[PDB]
Amino acid sequence: ALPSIQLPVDYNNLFNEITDFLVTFKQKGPKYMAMLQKVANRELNSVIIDLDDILQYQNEKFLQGTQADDLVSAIQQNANHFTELFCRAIDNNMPLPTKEIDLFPPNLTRRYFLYFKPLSQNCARRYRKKAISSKPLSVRQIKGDFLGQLITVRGIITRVSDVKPAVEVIAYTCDQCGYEVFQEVNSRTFTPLSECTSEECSQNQTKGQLFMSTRASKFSAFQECKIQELSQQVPVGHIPRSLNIHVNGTLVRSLSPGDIVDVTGIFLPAAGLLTETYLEAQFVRQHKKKFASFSLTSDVEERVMELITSGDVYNRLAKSIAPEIYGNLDVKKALLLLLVGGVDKRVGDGMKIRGDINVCLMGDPGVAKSQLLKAICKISPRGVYTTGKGSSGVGLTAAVMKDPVTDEMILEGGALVLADNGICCIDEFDKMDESDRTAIHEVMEQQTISISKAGINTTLNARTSILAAANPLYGRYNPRLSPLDNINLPAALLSRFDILFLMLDIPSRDDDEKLAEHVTYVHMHNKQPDLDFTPVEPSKMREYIAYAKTKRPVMSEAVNDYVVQAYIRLRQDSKREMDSKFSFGQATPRTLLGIIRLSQALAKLRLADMVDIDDVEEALRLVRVSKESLYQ
Amino acid sequence: DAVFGDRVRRFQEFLDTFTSYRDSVRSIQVYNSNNILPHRIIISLDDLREFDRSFWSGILVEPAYFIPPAEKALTDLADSMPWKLSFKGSFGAHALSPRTLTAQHLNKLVSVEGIVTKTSLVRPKLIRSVHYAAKTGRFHYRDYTDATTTLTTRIPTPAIYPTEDTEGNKLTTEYGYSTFIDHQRITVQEMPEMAPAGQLPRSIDVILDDDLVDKTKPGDRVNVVGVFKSLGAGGMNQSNSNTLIGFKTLILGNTVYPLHARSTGVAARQMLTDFDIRNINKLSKKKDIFDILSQSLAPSIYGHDHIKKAILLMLMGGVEKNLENGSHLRGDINILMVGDPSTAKSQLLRFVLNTASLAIATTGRGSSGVGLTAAVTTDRETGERRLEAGAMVLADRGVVCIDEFDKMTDVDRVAIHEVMEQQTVTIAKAGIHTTLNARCSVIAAANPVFGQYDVNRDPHQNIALPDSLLSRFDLLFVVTDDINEIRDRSISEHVLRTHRYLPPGYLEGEPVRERLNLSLAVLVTIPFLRKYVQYAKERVIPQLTQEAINVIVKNYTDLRNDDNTKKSPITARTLETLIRLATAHAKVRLSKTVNKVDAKVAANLLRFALL
DNA sequence: CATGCATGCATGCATGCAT
DNA sequence: ATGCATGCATGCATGCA
Ligand SMILES: Nc1ncnc2c1ncn2[C@@H]1O[C@H](COP(=O)(O)OP(=O)(O)O)[C@@H](O)[C@H]1O
Ligand SMILES: Nc1ncnc2c1ncn2[C@@H]1O[C@H](COP(=O)(O)OP(=O)(O)O)[C@@H](O)[C@H]1O
Ligand SMILES: [Mg+2]
Ligand SMILES: [Mg+2]
Ligand SMILES: [Zn+2]
Known part of the structure; x- marks a missing residue:
């Protein structure tokens, strides 16, 4: 019974190389000793191991000529066993708090969480060692052969739980004899201890009762998540699949629904021989950095300086949005101003005013409206794309649901809650039911939702910017009808937009040749024609817009006097046309607020603390050119 | 004990005679010496019949005492120069369906064809568990087995996970050094094309493991070869359990084949030989190739030479693009026909439905707009709100044939705008937000609003469709039944010629017989057309050249500024259309450059369609 | 099996256009 | 001025947990 087998591993030599690495490696003194010093001194609750460091250490030791072992390979194959080995070594080399403070299982004494960081690809190519832990895989490529290894999965998060306490080492106490018993837990359910097991109680005929002590137990933080496949990975004609993830320690709250991520972990198993699986998270990597995580590190300053000192930045950053689409310079400028936004305003009293810009594009067939909402949903770090048909109103706001992990009942949010602090690009705006658009009004104006159906009586938060696409009433434009009647949006909905462009397709033998040449060049060569313009890459553009969003310009009086005069001029000029029925509506204070917001955004893009008057001039020029196709 | 070795020897000498399978052993083995191919071989039962009848009848009738010996012989051969076996060929009366499977066939090798109705979630199974003891510093291992592992019956063993070593030293699991094997369970039913109408169908479970664990998806046509087995005890062991139950049955699959049908997900495929490739290359040299391949489409219909050219171009298709940023440029071609009654419209739709490698047919008011775009917000047994694929999702990389396209309501027509141009289906409703691929092409037929085409009125008064929709259709054709005298004499003679035809091997007056065509996936005849199309689509990708650039830019500019009247509006899309068609033609010639012709x-084609 | 929410299908009513 | 057709809005049927 229980025979024996021979393997090439050796859990003695590897532990020695572990200690050598952990107290002799340098990129200041030893690298990891300092991290342990911070842990002792109570400034760090997490220690992270970079496999690149281990690889470099063993490569250097090979250069020394002394024989060693392939530690990284051993970790990659069997990774759930090296966690405790590293914890043991870390518990035998810890220092004593240089600063001041104000048998038992070893885990009660530990206060730190060990995590492994996958092995990079560039280091692998540097030292010719093909890396298995840094190869992204789909949820459909993870099969039984991978159980027990350290791998990475690329996907999109769908559902996330709420952090909860999970007991790893229950503690008890005996009122009769005074001993302490410890029980380790590694399962979803457990049975507690009942009667004392000490020497004294054992000898005596009266055995005491034990009591759980909450304060002494080792409670950890537990969270669970679900990850799906990206549409670029699913095979032809199939449906995407899902996978589960566990998060324990100081990684909780590092995953939010809707985020495209690369997550590293250990693929571990859970009456039959069949078994459930899950990924124990060890390191997360976001594909698009959130704007509200920005810091002006030296590198990011060096990168933004080149853009600042390169002259034209407004045109450079507006020509770089969808560089395969010819023309539409003003449209791209207003869409670049969409990303930045104005400056929210609280008046200190119980009143607030939004600071985001809403934009609408109404035009004729085949003018590339959709392909610009698909590029704006990709530049933004938290973008969402939806089509008018495929929507329900509730599907945009919220509904009810129950959490499998815990027993709580939860409210699920729609696309407008996923896009919070982001752009919610709506295509086919005209074709969705008017009883479905009316839920967009409150989001557009108050940046909230109010649900008063059964079970739920509450409010949500949706700090979203809406980029809408629509078409005239009967397909193409009809010059005979009035501009207002040709479109099919009520006045109340129109007022809530700040920019409403009319992209009418009027043939002209001269300009169509340019479009034809651009498109056919885009097809013969897979890139855009111009050899003088070098568009800013999405990452460098996102980094600049993130730096710009930190400002909050104010206004002077020399600009206030201009703004008021322009508002009076526009609001007088508008009544004539509106009465004449050849118009677009009637100017309202929301027009003034939109002008102010556009000026603020143009000021921010310049990295300024004051709004110049050339910004209120650019804003007025944009709002004017918005309708300069109807006057062909 | 002695029969086993004799059977091993008899299969060894069977392999010795026929050396084909010997070749296919070095094959999956020299290549695993740097995807590792799986060690499964396929044997033709016809050869085994002509070699040794007794051994053949044993496999067919008594598999549990004949297959393991053959597997051992195969493993011995491989090692000398484990490996598992799959079977193909004729099965006689053993070839059945879920309806005709009875208790007479238990414990026999059978082949069953049907529709896959319910798949499961693949899971791993434990086959060997390793342990480490630090006190002694040694490794131990346990093994496990279950009923569905082997064909023969083995006394059950007391599966128990070891926790303590014989000396008492505590053990810890080594998850990375254990062994796991994948396992799926599926359900097969009688096909709708064969089940009697009005009667509930019959089902059978099938169990797959290892390398046969994920090869089909629900709603497909499948053929499974495996052993029909029995398990458990239907109350026999119990002193008093019941008198109304029986033994549980299932099939231990060892071969699975997907079958290609009409209006079904699976796509047809043929194996191309050296002869086929040589003939295709020789045929492509002739200058009238675009006419030879074009007059051979539906040769029983008279005329319509241009719609036939368009059909061939749609079948071949253009080349799509994916830019670095992440942009996507369409590469498909779509066709609309508007016509008078009896103009051979539905007979050309059915020709496409029958000759395309993958096509799905739909009528007008028949299927709703959620049945085409896959809005199947439903729920599964696990409880995850799931989207169920639809017609356009299932037809990814295929074709959709829409008949009575004018009867489709606007609430249904507007769901197709995204698919025809964006080639995706983004569904966002309560609790679900996802995007699926719908890279299909559409061919649709319709008739005027007045019953017949009124030449006096403007085209917009007849067609009566939005310009938004009309733009997405690459080519729109108008067909009119104009009463003539010279034309009627030709069209009557042709039609009467078709109605006087006798299949070879028939006696005049003998009725013809009809059958269902379930092929096994993986003027010129129709098979050669399919082979030509497959080769051209799979191994050709042309590139644009300056001459085509000039021709296209001239034609587009001229068309945009015109004083004529068109059946459809002209937008930027038309330019892309000209690029697609050009590429398709370059694909027909098996050329890597889109030349001027x-x-x-x-x-010429676009000008004929428009004017 | 009753309560109440979200999807999808069906019907009947009103308005506009044509004869 | 009347009738017919089309589009929209109100109702119901399903499906659910
Ligand atoms: N100005 C343009 N530059 C480049 N391509 C264009 C331009 N206008 C139209 N196109 C092409 O025409 C197509 C129009 O598709 P789409 O974005 O759906 O138009 P819309 O959404 O306005 O109906 C795109 O594939 C695009 O490549
Ligand atoms: N050009 C033609 N050549 C041969 N047969 C034709 C032709 N046009 C119509 N027919 C015959 O007339 C019948 C009309 O049926 P169908 O194709 O459904 O008409 P529709 O054009 O309304 O779809 C078919 O059975 C077909 O055989
Ligand atoms: Mg569009
Ligand atoms: Mg027909
Ligand atoms: Zn006690």
């Missing part, structure tokens, strides 16, 4: 032909 391609562009000229595209211009």
Whole structure:
């Protein structure tokens, strides 16, 4: 019974190389000793191991000529066993708090969480060692052969739980004899201890009762998540699949629904021989950095300086949005101003005013409206794309649901809650039911939702910017009808937009040749024609817009006097046309607020603390050119 | 004990005689010496019949005492120069369906064809568990087994996970050094094309493991070869359990084949030999190739030479693009026909439905707009709100044939705008937000609003469709039944010629017989057309050249500024259309450059369609 | 099996256009 | 001025947990 087998591993030599690495490696003194010093001194609750460091250490030791072992390979194959080995070594080399403070299982004494960081690809190519832990895989490529290894999965998060306490080492106490018993837990359910097991109680005929002590137990933080496949990975004609993830320690709250991520972990198993699986998270990597995580590190300053000192930045950053689409310079400028936004305003009293810009594009067939909402949903770090048909109103706001992990009942949010602090690009705006658009009004104006159906009586938060696409009433434009009647949006909905462009397709033998040449060049060569313009890459553009969003310009009086005069001029000029029925509506204070917001955004893009008057001039020029196709 | 070795020897000498399978052993083995191919071989039962009848009848009738010996012989051969076996060929009366499977066939090798109705979630199974003891510093291992592992019956063993070593030293699991094997369970039913109408169908479970664990998806046509087995005890062991139950049955699959049908997900495929490739290359040299391949489409219909050219171009298709940023440029072609009654419209839709490698047919008011775009917000047994695929999702990389396209309501027509141009289906409703691929092409037929085409009125008064929709259709054709005298004499003679035809091997007056065509996936005849299309689509990708650039830019500019009247509006999309058609033509010639003739032909075709 | 929410299908009513 | 057709809005049927 229980025979024996021979393997090439050796859990003695590897532990020695572990200690050598952990107290002799340098990129200041030893690298990891300092991290342990911070842990002792109570400034760090997490220690992270970079496999690149281990690889470099063993490569250097090979250069020394002394024989060693392939530690990284051993970790990659069997990774759930090296966690405790590293914890043991870390518990035998810890220092004593240089600063001041104000048998038992070893885990009660530990206060730190060990995590492994996958092995990079560039280091692998540097030292010719093909890396298995840094190869992204789909949820459909993870099969039984991978159980027990350290791998990475690329996907999109769908559902996330709420952090909860999970007991790893229950503690008890005996009122009769005074001993302490410890029980380790590694399962979803457990049975507690009942009667004392000490020497004294054992000898005596009266055995005491034990009591759980909450304060002494080792409670950890537990969270669970679900990850799906990206549409670029699913095979032809199939449906995407899902996978589960566990998060324990100081990684909780590092995953939010809707985020495209690369997550590293250990693929571990859970009456039959069949078994459930899950990924124990060890390191997360976001594909698009959130704007509200920005810091002006030296590198990011060096990168933004080149853009600042390169002259034209407004045109450079507006020509770089969808560089395969010819023309539409003003449209791209207003869409670049969409990303930045104005400056929210609280008046200190119980009143607030939004600071985001809403934009609408109404035009004729085949003018590339959709392909610009698909590029704006990709530049933004938290973008969402939806089509008018495929929507329900509730599907945009919220509904009810129950959490499998815990027993709580939860409210699920729609696309407008996923896009919070982001752009919610709506295509086919005209074709969705008017009883479905009316839920967009409150989001557009108050940046909230109010649900008063059964079970739920509450409010949500949706700090979203809406980029809408629509078409005239009967397909193409009809010059005979009035501009207002040709479109099919009520006045109340129109007022809530700040920019409403009319992209009418009027043939002209001269300009169509340019479009034809651009498109056919885009097809013969897979890139855009111009050899003088070098568009800013999405990452460098996102980094600049993130730096710009930190400002909050104010206004002077020399600009206030201009703004008021322009508002009076526009609001007088508008009544004539509106009465004449050849118009677009009637100017309202929301027009003034939109002008102010556009000026603020143009000021921010310049990295300024004051709004110049050339910004209120650019804003007025944009709002004017918005309708300069109807006057062909 | 002695029969086993004799059977091992008899299969060894069977392999010795026929050396084909010997070849296919070095094959999956020299290549695993740097995807590792799986060690499964396929044997033809016809050869085994002509070699040794007794051994053949044993496999067919008594598999549990004949297959393991053959597997051992195969493993011995491989090692000398484990490996598992799959079977193909004739099965006689053993070839059945879920309806005709009875208790007479238990414990026999059978082949069953049907529709896959319910798949499961693949899971791993434990086959060997390793342990480490630090006190002694040694490794131990346990093994496990279950009923569905082997064909023969083995006394059950007391599966128990070891926790303590014989000396008492505590053990810890080594998850990375254990062994796991994948396992799926599926359900097969009687096909709708064969089940009697009005009667509930019959089902059978099938169990797959290892390398046969994920090869089909629900709603497909499948053929499974495996052993029909029995398990458990239907109350026999119990002193008093019941008198109304029986033994549980299932099939231990060892071969699975997907079958290609009409209006079904699976796509047809043929194996191309050296002869086929040589003939295709020889045929592509002739200058009238675009006419030979074009007059051979539906040769029982008279005329319509241009719609036939368009059909061939749609079948071949253009080349799509994916830019670095992440942009996507369409590469498909779509066709609309508007016509008078009895103009051979539905007979050309059915020809496409029958000759395309993958096509799905739909009528008008029949299927709703959520049945085409896959809005199947439903729920599964696990409880995850799931989207169920639809017609356009299932037809990814295929074709959709829409009949009575004018009867489709606007609430249904507007769901197709995204698919025809964006080639995706983004569904966002309560609790679900996802995007699926719908890279399909559409061919649709319709008739005027007045019953017949009124030439006096303007085209917009007849067609009566939005310009938004009309733009997405690459080519729109108008067909009219104009009463003539010279034309009627030709069209009557042709029709009467078709109705006087006798299949070879028939006696005049003998009725013809009809059958269902379930092929096994993986003027010129129709098979050669399919082979030509497959080769051209799979191994050709042309590239644009300056000459085509000039022709296309001239034609587009001229068309935009015109004083004529068109059946459809002209937008930027038309330019892309000219590029697609050109590429398709270059694909027909098996060329890697879109030459000038391609562009000229595209211009002529579009001009005929419009004017 | 009753309560109440979200999807999808069906019907009947009103308005506009044509004869 | 009347009738017919089309589009929209109100109702119901399903499906659910
Ligand atoms: N100005 C343009 N530059 C480049 N391509 C264009 C331009 N206008 C139209 N196109 C092409 O025409 C197509 C129009 O598709 P789409 O974005 O759906 O138009 P819309 O959404 O306005 O109906 C795109 O594939 C695009 O490549
Ligand atoms: N050009 C033609 N050549 C041969 N047969 C034709 C032709 N046009 C119509 N027919 C015959 O007339 C019948 C009309 O049926 P169908 O194709 O459904 O008409 P529709 O054009 O309304 O779809 C078919 O059975 C077909 O065989
Ligand atoms: Mg569009
Ligand atoms: Mg028909
Ligand atoms: Zn006690």
